[PDB]
RNA sequence: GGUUCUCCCCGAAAGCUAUUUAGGUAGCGCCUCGUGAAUUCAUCUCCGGGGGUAGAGCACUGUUUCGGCAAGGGGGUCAUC
């Protein structure tokens with residue numbers, strides 16, 4: 001139970017750190033986001049087919 | 052901007068790389084928890100290594116002063132077939 005006082009050890013920030021995307025309500029990047037670069041599953045080429 | 056009860060144990064970072072990136076983020080570095088593993092790791096002594104820094108030096112690359120020797124160059128006087 002985060003954000004329930006100093007003694008709990010998870011108060012006033014809820015374990016989210018300080019003013020990042022993870023600290024915003026509904027914040028955070030999608031799966032595979034690499035900071036702006038095209039992710040590895042897009043740097044690498046497709047191969048093969050499904051039989 | 053704010054995030055509400057208590058105690059105990061451990062305990063950071065403000066670095067690297069990349070980004071329409073530079074008050075964001077991802078991986079790594081650093082933290083915690085769990086599970087494994089070796090006289091694994093750290094320190095010292097001794098031994099075996101590659102350095103080319105500090106310093107020094109002026110053979111080399113350059114730079115710099117004085118003296119000696121001295122072509123050569125410039126100026127003047129004659130001659131300038």
Ligand SMILES: [Mg+2]
Pocket residue numbers: 009010
């Ligand atoms: Mg805490």
Ligand SMILES: [Mg+2]
Pocket residue numbers: 016017018019020021022023
């Ligand atoms: Mg944060």
Ligand SMILES: [Mg+2]
Pocket residue numbers: 018019
């Ligand atoms: Mg805040």
Ligand SMILES: [Mg+2]
Pocket residue numbers: none
């Ligand atoms: Mg402590």
Ligand SMILES: [Mg+2]
Pocket residue numbers: none
């Ligand atoms: Mg780009």
Ligand SMILES: [Mg+2]
Pocket residue numbers: 073
């Ligand atoms: Mg930044």
Ligand SMILES: [Mg+2]
Pocket residue numbers: none
């Ligand atoms: Mg900040």
Ligand SMILES: [Mg+2]
Pocket residue numbers: 074075
């Ligand atoms: Mg920003």
Ligand SMILES: [Mg+2]
Pocket residue numbers: none
């Ligand atoms: Mg040197």
Ligand SMILES: [Mg+2]
Pocket residue numbers: 105
């Ligand atoms: Mg030196």
